[PDB]
Amino acid sequence: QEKEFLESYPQNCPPDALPGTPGNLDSAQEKALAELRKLLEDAGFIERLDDSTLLRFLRARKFDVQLAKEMFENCEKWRKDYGTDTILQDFHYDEKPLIAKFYPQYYHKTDKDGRPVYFEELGAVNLHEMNKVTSEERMLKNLVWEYESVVQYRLPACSRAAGHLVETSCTIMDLKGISISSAYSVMSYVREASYISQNYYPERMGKFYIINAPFGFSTAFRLFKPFLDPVTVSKIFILGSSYQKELLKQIPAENLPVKFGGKSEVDESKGGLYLSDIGPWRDPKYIGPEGEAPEAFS
């Protein structure tokens, strides 16, 4: 199944993409990739040795082969202990219709480069109400579940729809309603989620828009700017109460939801935006041999 699944969708990043992305390797990047491939092979590894996976790890370690082998090995260790390799069957987030309003997290269509768009309304989160029903451990299970649906279903379909490899998502994080107090209360979840993201899903973040940022924090960020990695800085966007134009630059109006200033609508019979999962991975044109992605609840 390994070799056919990847033949089922375009595997080249567009050429104007960052160096070391599939299809765009120079000689040395190619040598390093072959080298790390063989080094993992000899260690007795089989699956997930494709070009995309390994160039993500390498980009994450600036193509240092040894540290990339390291990070890969730790990631597989975590996959075994956590049960990731089967979570899509094992875990069932039956509470979602109940607690979605208390931490809106949802995927919706694609940006102009073909990336699935991911939305988190962090500033509206109410862990008081969420903790009446579920736990942080289960929230993180759902997050990994969603990441696995991204990798196994959302990205292959997005790649077919865009005509080229799609490896990343475009995140929109709404800060409207945030406070120091609610920051402390979400701190533990956000830090766990980040750890998972950076270490077991490297280079999956393509854009990261913060919107309704408080005036203070964005001024601060412009001064603090040199302290971050320049690539990371170019993927980040701080915006205030008027973000609609800058979002509509990156996401077609019929893809971006109305409440953020586009034209895309969801009908509230199914439970509206917070419970939806609309995009090319639900489109018969783009669903491939992997089948359609599972729904999160029934």
Residues engaged in binding ligand IUO (CB under 6 A): 118, 120, 147, 150-151, 168-169, 171, 173, 190, 193-194, 197, 201, 204-205
Q: Which is nearer to ligand POV, 8 or 74 (CB)?
A: 74
Q: Of these partners, ligand IUO, ligand POV, none, which one is at the site of residue 100 (CB under 5 to 8 Å by kind)? A: none
Q: Of these partners, ligand POV, ligand IUO, none, which one is at the site of residue 219 (CB under 5 to 8 Å by kind)? A: ligand POV
Residue 167 and residue 56 in contact, taking contact as beta carbons nearer than 8 Å? yes
Reference 168, options 117, 228, 210; nearest CA is: 117
Q: Of these partners, ligand IUO, ligand POV, none, which one is at the site of residue 169 (CB under 5 to 8 Å by kind)? A: ligand IUO
Planar angle of CA 41, 45, 47, nearest 5 degrees:
110
Q: Of these partners, ligand IUO, ligand POV, none, which one is at the site of residue 124 (CB under 5 to 8 Å by kind)? A: none
Q: Where are the alpha helices (DSSP H) in the chain?
A: 2-7, 27-42, 51-60, 65-82, 87-90, 96-99, 127-131, 136-149, 155-162, 180-200, 215-224, 230-234, 244-250
Reference 114, options 285, 258, 252, 289; nearest CA is: 252
Residue 55 and residue 116 in contact, taking contact as beta carbons nearer than 8 Å? no
Q: Which is nearer to ligand POV, 51 or 174 (CB)?
A: 174
Residue 59 and residue 18 in contact, taking contact as beta carbons nearer than 8 Å? yes
- In angstroms, give the least distance from the CB of 7 to ligand POV: 31
The size of the interface with ligand POV (CB under 6 A), counted in residues, is: 19
Q: Which is nearer to ligand IUO, 39 or 235 (CB)?
A: 235
Give the number of other Cβ atoms within 10 Å of residue 169's Cβ. Answer: 22
**179 binds ligand POV, rule: CB under 6 A:** yes
Q: Which is nearer to ligand IUO, 150 or 247 (CB)?
A: 150
**131 binds ligand POV, rule: CB under 6 A:** no
| DSSP classification of residue 270 | T
Q: Which of 217, 286, 287, 290 binds ligand POV (CB under 6 A)?
A: 217
| DSSP classification of residue 51 | H
- In angstroms, give the least distance from the CB of 197 to ligand IUO: 4
φ, ψ dihedrals at 174, nearest 5°: -85, 120
Q: How far is CA 212 from CA 141, 143, 215, in A?
A: 28, 23, 9
**180 binds ligand POV, rule: CB under 6 A:** yes
Q: Of these partners, ligand POV, ligand IUO, none, which one is at the site of residue 28 (CB under 5 to 8 Å by kind)? A: none
- In angstroms, give the least distance from the CB of 104 to ligand POV: 14
| DSSP classification of residue 183 | H
Kindly indicate which of the ranges 47-55, 77-85, 108-116, 170-178 contains the residues binding ligand POV, using the contact rule CB under 6 A.
Answer: 170-178
Residue 174's SS3 state is strand
Residues of this chain that interact with ligand POV (CB under 6 A) are 173, 175, 178-180, 183, 190, 194, 197-198, 210, 214-217, 219-220, 223-224
